[PDB]
Amino acid sequence: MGPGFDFAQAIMKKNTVIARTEKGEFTMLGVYDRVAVIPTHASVGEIIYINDVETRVLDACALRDLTDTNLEITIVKLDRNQKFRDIRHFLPRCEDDYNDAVLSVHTSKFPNMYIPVGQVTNYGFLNLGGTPTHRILMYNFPTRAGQCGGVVTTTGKVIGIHVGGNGAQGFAAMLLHSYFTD
Ligand SMILES: Fc1cc(F)c2c(c1)C=CCO2
Numbered sequence: 555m556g557p558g559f560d561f562a563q564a565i566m567k568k569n570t571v572i573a574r575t576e577k578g579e580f581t582m583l584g585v586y587d588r589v590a591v592i593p594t595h596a597s598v599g600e601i602i603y604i605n606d607v608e609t610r611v612l613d614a615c616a617l618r619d620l621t622d623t624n625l626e627i628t629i630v631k632l633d634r635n636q637k638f639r640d641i642r643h644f645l646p647r648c649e650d651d652y653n654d655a656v657l658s659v660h661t662s663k664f665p666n667m668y669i670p671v672g673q674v675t676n677y678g679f680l681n682l683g684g685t686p687t688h689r690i691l692m693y694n695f696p697t698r699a700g701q702c703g704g705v706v707t708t709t710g711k712v713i714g715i716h717v718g719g720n721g722a723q724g725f726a727a728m729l730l731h732s733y734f735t736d
Pocket residue numbers: 555556557559
């Protein structure tokens with residue numbers, strides 16, 4: 555439904571998996587090799603289910619900024635037998651605002667879901683579920699339970715992962731290229 559829905563669909567088909575923790579199912583974005591991202595409130599353990607396959611977690615790191623503030627992103631290395639397509643070239647280098655974004659979700663209960671959210675604001679600080687959080691993007695769509703881990707894109711950029719909402723607005727944690735230098 556535009557170059558943006560074409561790009562969102564390409565990212566969902568090749569670079570997402572369904573991740574299940576004790577906290578439910580999440581859209582999980584694969585970034586390169588066996589490295590993926592998920593919201594930190596998924597509470598990733600030693601074992602995770604990936605497309606309903608029991609998978610060992612080789613490493614999991616909840617990112618914080620250099621002020622020691624939550625970013626709500628956990629980077630996970632999976633003991634999976636297959637690598638992701640490398641999409642690090644689609645990650646922005648800096649904090650920014652965006653036009654005409656799409657939020658895309660794929661879980662067992664929420665498959666094949668694409669949401670045009672429009673304008674994305676570099677919001678910055680959010681008290682997210684009582685936790686001070688930085689590098690938040692905001693869009694004016696009444697997102698619900700189900701969309702956590704959803705991927706926010708524009709044409710040719712993967713810009714964030716959905717982490718919350720207040721009934722009127724939705725919030726995503728930024729993805730930056732510098733998080734995934736090996
Ligand atoms: F069949 C479709 C569906 C869309 F959403 C499109 C197009 C064609 C082409 C461009 C943007 O929007």
